[PDB]
Ligand binder design. Structure first.
Ligand SMILES: O=c1ccn([C@@H]2O[C@H](COP(=O)(O)OP(=O)(O)O[C@H]3O[C@H](CO)[C@H](O)[C@H](O)[C@H]3O)[C@@H](O)[C@H]2O)c(=O)[nH]1
Ligand SMILES: CCCCCCCCO[C@@H]1O[C@H](CO)[C@H](O)C[C@H]1O[C@@H]1O[C@@H](C)[C@@H](O)[C@@H](O)[C@@H]1O
Ligand SMILES: [Mn+2]
Length: 292
């Protein structure tokens, strides 16, 4: 049950004055695409606080990637769901390497020890299995689950505007691309296969989420698909991301996050269409960091 909002004073939405005219702000299945200027955060904060919303955030920091945790967590403290209940779940093979980060009130962190796989691809891919059925405390502890890469930092507001039954994020590399150019898995022998005449968007593996129920469905489905591929001796071109794209093609997200929510400034600069850079890639030497 949802109680009444209080009296609030804010600017009236004007029907004949769009918030943004430069970008698509709703998908053809009527899911909002979240861009700066499309939402009044004061209204959303009220709505979500009235439900006493708890948000779980998963992050994997395996082998050398433990090094990214300090900046990830300390910037999350500044920018992620501030004012709301947050539970961080840090999955790692090195619990003792998790930095001691000071948290704001109503926020907690749990360290979950997992095995490290040799291949960086396997580490990235096994996140689906680990999130799903494996971790069962989510249904009891949180309302929504957000699942992100660790090799990142928050620079601006990431808040309740993202919350919805199911969301994916537009990959910063491809938001302007036509579907034939998307790096979907193209081999029919893979469960992740998507033909050149199908596809809405190219979502990045580094930021997805939803209600606990929908996230468990997504991760379960992706894990089972990866298992079928493995039994068939095929590995999708972009690993977990290929399966995530297949899933979101066949199960449309109820919100889509703009690339404000996943950006690499070194690689892609700061285009006019991005009014804020919210959650951004931390430079890494891929080869060095992925191998002993
Ligand atoms: O040794 C490792 C390798 C990977 N990871 C975890 O796996 C995540 C994804 O790996 P990368 O960050 O190296 O992947 P990229 O950002 O380079 O590339 C993108 O493609 C991947 C598939 O190749 C994933 O889908 C990922 O979400 C997506 O952003 C990392 O953030 C980290 O959380 C580790 O913890 N340790
Ligand atoms: C066309 C130009 C491509 C621009 C970016 C490509 O990024 C890479 O895309 C892959 C799928 O095609 C996959 O998601 C990995 C992704 O690379 C990652 O994300 C980028 C934004 C960078 O941060 C990069 O270093 C990182 O490895
Ligand atoms: Mn990453």
């Amino acid at each position: 049950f949802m109680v009444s909002l209080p009296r609030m004073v804010y600017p009236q939405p004007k029907v004949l004055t769009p918030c943004r005219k430069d970008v698509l702000v709703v998908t053809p299945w009527l899911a909002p695409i979240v861009w700066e200027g499309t939402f009044n955060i004061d209204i959303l904060n009220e709505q979500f606080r009235l439900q006493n919303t708890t948000i779980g955030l998963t992050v994997f920091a395996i082998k050398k990637y433990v090094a990214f945790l300090k900046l990830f967590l300390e910037t999350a403290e500044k920018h992620f769901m501030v004012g709301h209940r947050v539970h961080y779940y840090v999955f790692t093979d090195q619990p003792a390497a998790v930095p001691r980060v000071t948290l704001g009130t109503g926020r907690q962190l749990s360290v979950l020890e997992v095995r490290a796989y040799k291949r960086w691809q396997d580490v990235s891919m096994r996140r689906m299995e680990m999130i799903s059925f494996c971790e069962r405390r989510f249904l009891s502890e949180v309302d929504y689950l957000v699942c992100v890469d660790v090799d990142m930092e928050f620079r601006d507001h990431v808040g309740v505007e993202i919350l919805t039954p199911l969301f994916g994020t537009l990959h910063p590399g491809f938001y302007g691309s036509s579907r034939e150019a998307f790096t979907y898995e193209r081999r029919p022998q893979s469960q992740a296969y998507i033909p050149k005449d199908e596809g809405d968007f190219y979502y990045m593996g580094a930021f997805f989420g939803g209600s606990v129920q929908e996230v468990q469905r997504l991760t379960r489905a992706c894990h089972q698909a990866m298992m079928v591929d493995q039994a068939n001796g095929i590995e999708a071109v972009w690993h977990d991301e290929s399966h995530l794209n297949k899933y979101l093609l066949r199960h449309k997200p109820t919100k889509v996050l703009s690339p404000e929510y996943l950006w690499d400034q070194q690689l892609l600069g700061w285009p006019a269409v991005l009014r804020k850079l919210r959650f951004t890639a931390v430079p890494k030497n891929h080869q060095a960091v992925r191998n002993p």
